[PDB]
């Protein structure tokens, strides 16, 4: 949140109304078809009508691939799960290569549970029995319980007085019972009764606030994968387990199936929702052949997410293959199953406009005559390196007494540190 | 460190019975209070594997471990 | 959820089983032996609150009896006896079984306890008075379904009998 | 109309294989398009699978990509139904760290072979209609059910009453006895709880009385794979295992009591093998320790009907610097027969496409279906599928009701194929790493 | 009817009195020299003389290695272990390819155990705190003192006054079966199983006989399920898993057993190992297999091969005759498998058909043996079964060559596929 | 006695490296035949293993397959006695999962070295007379005697029941009763004095006090990477008991037989490994030429380096003469108790020396079954023609392999 990232001021795809991107909004500059077409991708996303449908952003570095994941993410927003991978995470040590991709896979399903529980609570002010003659014997149990609203007295089932003295109530005892078990529940000494020489933590409560009988819901986030754990491993076996390592455990497809069902059940009742929500899978060339394998039945599971890939490779050659060179690392037989967005170079424009937007987000000041020096720079060199010359110079700025950027403090930054091509220059010679 | 190790019973006590399963020790020859002033080489590899897992621990989790 | 059809399906036994290898030694040494002694004696006292838990989940499956099921499958006389009194029973009726065999009555009463049904056996080897107690009882007590005699007891001591059906198992 | 766990794959048209009685395919039914050899041969080896007389039976689906093999293989799997176990796996999840490649294949096949248990129970089932539980502060109590035919008061044994007082047994509860064990199961309510009880906020639906006898001879059914069966009996803790996947190498001489046991189950009355499916889509990432262990594995009395699919033709086995077809050594492909898939034509490109359309709710111009037929033959037919749902997108922005050919057009030049991105990196290629 | 497998039909070897193979019998047809060389090694093996004795079936794919293994296993029966294993089973993740080894080694080696079994059954009376408890059957009552580590076992049964228990004290295991069948009465309704009461002595003693490997005496000794003793139990909750059993725990079992046979309270079974796919094995397993064999303890080892002249695994650039170096060659016997003639094929396709309860005329015969002429045998036989179900279908019981035809159309071998692609 | 656990192997008929008090090795002795040389060079090494004073010797046996190397390691196993440690292991056995090569080596080098340990106690065997608790009495078939319980050997009477008649041994320093039965009476001595020797290899002491119940690391396995804190402060209390005179060391002899599977890091190991004064004298064996060193791209005259090459000395085998390969046959037959005419020991040599010395001794077992199958006696030429018709040998093999090469798979 408070440090500023390499995307930190992508705040969205910046779209009209009538799906075309702005020119220059939300942060992004240009790349209007992709753009575009990652509205595309969102509408698809939100639609949830489609399962396992991929899209590859494919183009040259320092294109926006990311920025427009990152962006599509902003536009989903905080409700639809977003999971972030990178390709080398798949070489696990604890676990297979498939398992880690079908876990993140699950972990971009996400489900909102929907809890409505009716209490009972309050300061307990009497717990007369009310005997009576069998058609000694009780047939209510009347419980008085206050809160700083009020009073109320309830008329609950005789059976309650076992679990009363198993949880040891008594007068002004803090209690709370549930509507549908009719178990009570004790919380401590209500803290009007505690005294100031008197030692004890736990067995002190405040006085609840609200009405004795309070109707609450409880809403809770989680994912497939979530669920996916819990019930893999509950938690002697269970010291013996805390003991022990707790590593990943490749999953099988019998909990997988039977997690599905309970949520489907769930979700009958009505007391779940799901959000499916998308899996971005970034340096994807770096996944070997299995993977991508893998990826092939993966995509045609209809309880996958939307996957988001990003390459940058071009013709290269895939990984785990010997000499089998494809179009961008990724084997022909996965790249039929995705849709490719290109994402095109920047023009000196967009450079200038990039960087300003960096320099906003900032906070640096930069002059109009250091911000083209700057974006001649980056015309040569790279976005990125331009880019990453703001800071220093306005530190440099900072040191020599300026509060804005001077040509000659970029002129001075640029001397000190040096790019990629540079450094191969002087590698060379 | 308060440490106390029983080791064994007196050899003045063999002959209290004809056969008993006990480890008779001889009388300590010195005085009752014996100091020494004592050397030990350690490398700090042993010191690092001391610490790298609890011992002579009485919790569960450390009689398991 | 799978505890019923765990139980079902729980039967390997190991074909051997073995202690631990114990480490023998003469003369032990008094501090090997005071730590291994307290190192046991914190096991269980600290395993005291969850003994039988560990028990329960380390014991290994040594034994496999065969299924009770297997008695009625075993003879086509015993599964048509099964209907016979599935029926009987459905009458309300009381059903009295004989047989000639000690060990084939003694099968009877494996396949009636696996149908969940009273009984009451008077074999030969019931004296007389025994004999005229169980069936007094039988008589008194109209819950037990099923009375099964042996063909060789002297039933010549039994003058009423409250039963209705008689099912001869052997001739 | 909710969001299911399930939705809209790739393969959701597929609902069988579209035969008639002689196994003829149809040209459209039950999702099925063309591939009339192909459908035929897969209806002969679903019948051969149904039948269960023959065992380790392997057909390698081999076709061209796109072809429709895992298509072939889905409508196998929605024709022979959820009763006959059907395990598909991907040839890249038998790399496993916790397992060697030829136990996972064990556990594959082991997995792909049902054991339907069979058991009689004695089963009590009624009306609670009185209870009354005494104890001292031995148990004693008495319990009154009925069923519409008859009434019926028991009397208790402690762990009888115990496990009622732990079930919570009331008055109008339609409950479920296990006489075998004593196991309680709650069926519903018939009534209401007293009105003048505070809380017990509920009005939950109330079950229909039972009817007929109190205690009934019920049979019961209980499916069980062999790699469940395995799985329990590999340790005290076992069915922990089934769950989490943490399973080791199980050992050969459990597997061979197992066999042995499921044998006499299946010679007495006990049990019913019910052998399945284990398809291996793209079985050539396998290798060749794992086809070796294929060959022998099918030889086994156990071993389910294995189903491949791949698109590699003579291509090198994996591990080895030896070139074969589909992948696959010769001493396997001799074990199996091959079907082969052939590429589509105009008309089944289009009902394709139409069916797709229909299965993702898409009205779609006629004039629309040409462009994309035609788009479809050009680059590839999943391609085309994909820009019916982007068409789709792209029809309801501008608050179209059906997908035209500017909607075509324009996620066409949206969303590139595998061919005019390959131009286009080709045009750029400097700017790409390591050309 | 069981299911059919590949190699249902072998039932043996098919030898006269005089060890020669005759042209069609035990559902073996032809390799009259492969299944004579396989008889004198069933007659080795019979012997019990002779430790790591090595044979190779060497020869084309589909020439019945497989099936002369498999009708070698039937010649021994039952009785003489029988451990089929593949090359490629030895690349566990637990435990080395050597240790993979030596188990497969130590499994062929049986061995028949007669063990006197004493059984306490009856009903229980009195569980009086060492605990002196009391049973009852339908001769009479004892009463019996027993160790804690009962006591505890009885518990862990939570066994009452009243219920039928059965206690063998060999293995310190007790098995609770059920409440006595007197007090089936006494409840209308009860959570628990009643039985009758045994019929026998309270205390009895049975001799048995058990079948054992090497292999399960030395994993029961390396990991120790009998301990029932605090730190065993603690033990025994750890995640099994193989472990690298040493050569002084192989040692100890060997001297065990050699007291047992001395006793004559048990009787040593030699067996055979069985190799399919041994040039699956890499150099470190033919090496370790070098000293393996030579050992006075292994087995009867059967190897098959179907490769020509390829390179080693584990190896760089060293080739040999069938994939297993010429220091292991030289250690075995060779047998050779020879192509089938057209004749026997169609006797093999018979056979196959006559297996799966397939009726065939004798026109399809004769095109199904022309297919086979081509393509391969295994090919010609599966298409037995699809050209059946079509012959149901079709309403006919029996093959035509109509539905051959059909089925050859439908499913392509290895060459036309391979035609196809090229 | 019949089918006992250690049947008829390879190197069954050898016991001993048949050597005289000159170490000149006889014709046909101990099963052994030919050879001299190295049989000489076999039994120097047995001389120097005997002694124990030199550490770190190590000898490598080099020749031709079947040329009797495994045989020669055999028989100087058997010659060495069965006190003193002899490991064999195959080379491929130090690729553990569960340990690293040189760990493995580290365990089998320590395997190979004893450490022998005589300790006194007291053992009294009778039979019991009375049992008063505390008083015992027990009693020998030539005296009887009383004994006053302590509580400690109270409790232990008391948890094994004692009671008299039993005949029972106790251990006077543990209380280690155990019932041997009820009643033959002991005879002698009722309490006696016995020294009992235990050889204990230095893996055993280290796995021993690794762990608690270490020692069960012994049997199946599971032993990691013994730390070498451990293993050092064993090293310097077994000098403390060499010293003290409580042990005294046996240096055995570890055999890794096919030694060329190890890699450059194992042969590097050993390099340094057999340079400590508790290294044991190292056997090897390998029918490699000059071939390439596993894990290297480099060839070197056996597949070992030449520096381990120049810590050891070699020993050659050569090939047998015709003689020698009969003597072999004779010795072989006698073993298995196998019958042979003299024209079929003569068919046999020359089938011996045409293709292969293991052959023929597969032969001999065929043979006998072939001729125990017609009813027969003694093994005839016609047996042998029939075993040679059945059972192919590796040249015979190749060439039928190469007439039919379009048929087999992968074949080049
Ligand atoms: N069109 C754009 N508009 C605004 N910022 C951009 C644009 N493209 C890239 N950036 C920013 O410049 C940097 C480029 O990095 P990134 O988008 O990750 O490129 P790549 O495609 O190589 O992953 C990031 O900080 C990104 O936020
Ligand atoms: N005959 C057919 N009928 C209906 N849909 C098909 C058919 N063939 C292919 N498809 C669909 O077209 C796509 C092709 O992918 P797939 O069938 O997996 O081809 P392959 O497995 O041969 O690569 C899938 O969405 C598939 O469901
Ligand atoms: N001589 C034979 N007689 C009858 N059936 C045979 C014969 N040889 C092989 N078969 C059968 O033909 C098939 C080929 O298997 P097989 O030849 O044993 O494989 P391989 O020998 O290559 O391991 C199997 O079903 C086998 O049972
Ligand atoms: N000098 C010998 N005397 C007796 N038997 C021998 C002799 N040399 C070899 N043998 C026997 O011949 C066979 C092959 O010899 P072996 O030592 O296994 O060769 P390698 O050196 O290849 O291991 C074995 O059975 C072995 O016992
Ligand atoms: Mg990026
Ligand atoms: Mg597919
Ligand atoms: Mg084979
Ligand atoms: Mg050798």
């Given at each position: ?6 995307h930190s ?6 779209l ?10 939300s ?6 078809n ?8 969102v ?7 489609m399962?396992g449908?991929?899209?590859?952003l ?8 990311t ?12 409700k639809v799960?977003?999971c972030?991978?990178?390709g080398?995470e798949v ?7 498939t ?6 896979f699950?972990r ?10 009716e ?7 009497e ?8 058609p ?17 007295q309830?008329?609950?089932?005789p059976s ?14 803090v209690?709370?019972?549930e509507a549908?078990?009719?178990?009570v ?7 009007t009764y ?7 933590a736990?067995e002190?409560?405040?006085?609840p606030?609200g ?12 994912t497939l ?6 019930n ?10 805390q ?17 599905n069902?309970?949520v ?5 009742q ?5 959000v ?17 394998t893998?990826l ?9 997410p939307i996957?988001?890939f990003?390459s ?11 000499d ?8 022909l037989?996965?790249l039929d ?16 406009q990039?960087?300003?937007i ?13 911000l083209?020096?700057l974006?001649?720079?980056?015309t040569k060199?790279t ?16 040191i020599?007494?300026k ?9 001075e930054?640029?001397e ?14 | 460190?308060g440490a ?5 019973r ?20 010195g005085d009752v ?7 030990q080489?350690?490398?700090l590899?042993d010191?690092?594997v ?9 919790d569960?989790?450390?009689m398991?471990? | 959820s799978?505890?019923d ?11 051997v089983?073995?202690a631990?290898?114990?480490l023998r030694?003469?003369?032990?040494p ?12 914190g ?6 609150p ?8 380390t ?15 075993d ?16 009458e ?6 004989l ?10 009463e ?9 009984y ?17 009882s ?9 009375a099964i ?5 002297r039933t ?8 209705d ?7 | ?6 939705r809209?794959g790739?393969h959701?048209?597929?609902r069988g294989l579209?035969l008639?009685?002689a ?28 039948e269960?007389?023959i065992?380790?039976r ?23 139904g959820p ?10 999840e038998?790399?496993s ?8 294949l ?22 609670v ?11 004693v ?12 008061i ?14 919570k ?10 006489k ?12 209401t ?13 109330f ?6 006898e ?19 009996n590999?340790?005290?803790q076992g ?12 050992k ?5 009591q197992?066999?042995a ?8 009355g006990?049990?019913?093998i019910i ?7 793209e079985v050539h990432?396998?290798?060749?320790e ?14 389910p ?9 003579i ?6 610097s ?6 696959i ?16 034509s105009?008309?089944?490109?289009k009902?394709?496409l ?7 709710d898409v ?13 479809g033959?050009?680059?590839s037919?999943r391609y085309?599928?994909?820009?019916i749902?982007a ?8 608050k179209?009701?059906?997908v035209?050919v500017?909607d ?10 595998e ?5 286009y990196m080709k045009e750029?290629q400097?700017?790409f790493?390591?050309?």
């Amino acid at each position: 949140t408070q440090r500023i990232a390499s995307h930190s001021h992508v705040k969205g795809l910046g779209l009209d109304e009538s799906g075309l991107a702005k020119q220059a909004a939300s942060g992004l500059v240009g790349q209007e078809n992709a753009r575009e077409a990652c509205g595309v991708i969102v509408e698809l996303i939100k639609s949830k009508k489609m399962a396992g449908r991929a899209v590859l952003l494919a183009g040259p570095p320092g294109t926006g691939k990311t920025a427009l994941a990152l962006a599509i993410a902003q536009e989903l927003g905080s409700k639809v799960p977003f999971c972030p991978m990178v390709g080398s995470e798949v070489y696990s040590t604890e676990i297979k290569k498939t398992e880690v991709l079908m876990e993140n896979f699950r972990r971009a399903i996400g489900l909102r549970i929907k809890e409505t529980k009716e209490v009972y609570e309050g300061e307990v002010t009497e717990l007369t029995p009310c005997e009576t003659e069998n058609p000694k014997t009780i047939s209510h149990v009347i419980i008085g319980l206050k809160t700083a609203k009020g009073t109320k007295q309830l008329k609950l089932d005789p059976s309650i007085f076992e679990s009363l003295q198993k949880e040891r109530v008594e007068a002004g005892d803090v209690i709370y019972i549930e509507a549908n078990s009719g178990a009570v529940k004790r919380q401590g000494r209500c803290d009007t009764y505690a005294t100031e020489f008197d030692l004890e933590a736990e067995e002190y409560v405040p006085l609840p606030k609200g009405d004795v009988h309070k109707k609450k819901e409880i809403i809770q986030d989680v994912t497939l994968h979530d669920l996916d754990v819990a019930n893999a491993r509950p938690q002697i076996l269970s010291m013996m387990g805390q003991l022990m390592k707790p590593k990943k455990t490749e999953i099988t497809d019998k909990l997988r199936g039977e997690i599905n069902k309970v949520v489907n059940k769930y979700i009958d009742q009505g007391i779940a929702e799901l959000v499916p929500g998308v899996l971005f899978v970034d340096e994807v060339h770096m996944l070997d052949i299995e993977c991508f394998t893998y990826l092939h039945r993966a995509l045609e599971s209809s309880i996958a997410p939307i996957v988001i890939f990003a390459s940058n490779r071009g013709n290269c050659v895939i990984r785990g293959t010997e000499d089998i060179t494809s179009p961008h690392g990724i084997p022909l037989d996965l790249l039929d199953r995705v849709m490719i967005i290109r994402t095109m170079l920047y023009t000196p424009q967009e450079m200038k406009q990039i960087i300003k937007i960096r320099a906003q987000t900032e906070g640096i000041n930069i002059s109009e005559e250091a911000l083209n020096h700057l974006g001649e720079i980056g015309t040569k060199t790279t976005l990125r390196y331009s880019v990453q010359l703001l800071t220093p110079a306005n530190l440099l700025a900072k040191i020599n007494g300026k509060d804005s950027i001077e040509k000659e403090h970029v002129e001075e930054i640029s001397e000190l540190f040096y790019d990629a091509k540079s450094s191969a220059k002087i590698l060379a010679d | 460190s308060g440490a106390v190790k029983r080791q064994g019973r007196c050899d003045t006590y063999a002959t209290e019975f004809d056969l008993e399963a006990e480890e008779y020790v001889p009388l300590p020859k010195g005085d009752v209070h014996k100091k020494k002033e004592i050397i030990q080489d350690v490398t700090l590899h042993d010191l690092d594997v001391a610490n790298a897992r609890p011992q002579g621990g009485q919790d569960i989790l450390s009689m398991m471990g | 959820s799978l505890q019923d059809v765990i139980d079902r399906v729980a039967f390997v036994i190991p074909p051997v089983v073995a202690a631990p290898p114990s480490l023998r030694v003469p003369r032990p040494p008094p501090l090997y032996s005071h730590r291994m002694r307290i190192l046991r004696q914190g096991l269980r006292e600290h395993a005291a609150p969850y003994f039988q838990q560990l028990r329960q989940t380390t014991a290994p499956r040594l034994l496999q009896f065969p299924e009770l099921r297997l008695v009625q499958f075993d003879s086509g006389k015993l599964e048509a006896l099964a209907i016979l009194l599935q029926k009987l029973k459905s009458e309300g009726r009381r059903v009295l079984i004989l047989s000639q065999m000690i060990l084939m009555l003694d099968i009877l009463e494996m396949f009636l306890n696996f149908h969940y049904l009273t009984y009451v056996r008077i074999d030969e080897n019931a004296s007389s008075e025994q004999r005229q107690e169980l069936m007094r009882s039988f008589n008194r007590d109209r819950r037990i379904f099923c009375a099964i005699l042996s063909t060789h007891s002297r039933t010549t001591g039994i003058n009423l009998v409250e039963a209705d059906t008689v099912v001869f198992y052997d001739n | 109309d909710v969001t299911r766990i399930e939705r809209i794959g790739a393969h959701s048209h597929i609902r069988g294989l579209g035969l008639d009685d002689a196994l003829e395919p149809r040209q459209a039914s039950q999702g099925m398009v063309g591939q009339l050899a192909a459908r035929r041969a897969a209806g002969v080896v679903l019948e051969m699978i149904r039948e269960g007389k023959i065992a380790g039976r392997a057909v390698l689906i081999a076709g061209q990509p796109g072809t429709g093999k895992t298509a072939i293989a889905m409508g196998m799997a929605q024709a022979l139904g959820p009763d006959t176990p059907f395990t598909a796996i991907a040839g890249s999840e038998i790399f496993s760290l916790e397992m060697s490649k030829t136990e996972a294949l064990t556990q594959a096949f082991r997995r792909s072979i049902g054991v339907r248990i069979k058991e009689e129970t004695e089963i009590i089932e009624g009306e609670v209609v009185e209870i009354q539980i005494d104890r001292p502060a031995s148990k004693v109590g008495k319990l009154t059910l009925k069923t519409t035919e008859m009434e019926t008061i028991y009397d208790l044994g402690t762990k009888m009453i115990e496990s009622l007082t732990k079930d919570k047994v009331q008055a109008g509860d339609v409950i479920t006895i296990d006489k075998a064990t004593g196991k309680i199961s709650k069926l519903g309510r018939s009534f209401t709880r007293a009105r003048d009880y505070d809380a017990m906020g509920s009005q939950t639906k109330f079950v229909q009385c039972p009817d007929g006898e109190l205690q009934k001879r019920k049979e019961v059914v209980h499916t069980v794979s062999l790699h469940e069966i395995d799985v329990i009996n590999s340790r005290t803790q076992g069915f922990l295992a089934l769950f989490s996947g943490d399973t080791g190498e199980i050992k050969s001489e459990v597997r061979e009591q197992i066999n042995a046991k499921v044998a006499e189950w299946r010679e007495e009355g006990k049990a019913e093998i019910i052998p399945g499916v284990l398809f291996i889509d793209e079985v050539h990432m396998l290798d060749i320790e794992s086809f070796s262990f294929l060959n022998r594995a099918l030889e086994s009395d156990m071993a389910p009907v294995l189903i491949m699919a791949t698109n590699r033709g003579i291509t090198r086995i994996r591990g080895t610097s030896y070139q074969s077809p589909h992948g696959i050594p010769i001493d396997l492909l001799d074990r199996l027969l091959i079907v082969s898939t052939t590429p589509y034509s105009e008309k089944d490109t289009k009902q394709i496409l139409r069916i797709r359309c229909e299965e993702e709710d898409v009205e779609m111009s006629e004039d629309a279906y040409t462009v994309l037929t035609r788009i479809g033959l050009e680059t590839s037919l999943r391609y085309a599928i994909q820009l019916i749902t982007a068409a789709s997108l792209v029809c309801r922005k501008r608050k179209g009701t059906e997908v035209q050919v500017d909607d075509i057009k324009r996620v066409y030049s949206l969303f590139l194929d595998e061919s005019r991105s390959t131009q286009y990196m080709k045009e750029y290629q400097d700017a790409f790493l390591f050309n």
